[PDB]
């Protein structure tokens, strides 16, 4: 799963992109979801994402990613 794929899955779950800031050749995007008092911060682009990361992303977003 790519960074962009993970971002779109989060958007499907109601997370909204706040914007993105320039970085070591790539960037970081932050997302927030109405009613949730958490931020998700992700590097992009990434061609591959670890299951370790995805597992934690599942916990923060409250959805499965597969």
């Amino acid at each position: 799963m790519e960074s962009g794929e993970l971002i779109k899955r989060l958007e499907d779950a109601g997370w909204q992109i706040r914007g993105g800031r320039k970085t070591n050749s790539g960037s970081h995007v932050t997302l927030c979801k109405p009613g949730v008092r958490k931020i998700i911060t992700l590097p992009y682009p990434r061609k591959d994402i670890s299951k370790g990361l995805l597992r934690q992303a599942q916990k923060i977003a409250g959805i499965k990613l597969s």
Binding site: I39, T41, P43, R46, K47, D48, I49, S50, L53, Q56
Partner: protein, 86 residues
């Protein structure tokens, strides 16, 4: 200040997150790359928390909290350290 990161092998190199900072993810091709990316992720993430009015994380906990963290065991996670100066 020294912060713990949890990192995991990818095809490109590594990615992971700050175990004390829920939602703060990062990635890099080399260990030097991922430490730079982590600092960047940290700064962007803290400023978002402050702008939104969400809880800010506390400094790193007791070593026991990381040694007992099941997320390391679950997915082939490795503990690393990044210097961050707010």
């Amino acid at each position: 200040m020294i912060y713990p990161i949890f990192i995991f092998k990818t095809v490109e190199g590594f990615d992971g997150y700050f175990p004390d900072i829920d939602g703060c993810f990062f990635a890099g091709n080399t260990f030097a790359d991922i430490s730079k990316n982590a600092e960047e992720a940290f700064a962007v993430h803290i400023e978002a928390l402050m702008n939104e009015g969400f809880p800010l994380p506390s400094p790193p906990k007791d070593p026991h909290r990381y040694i007992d963290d099941p997320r390391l065991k679950e997915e082939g996670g490795i503990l690393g350290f990044v210097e961050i100066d707010p």
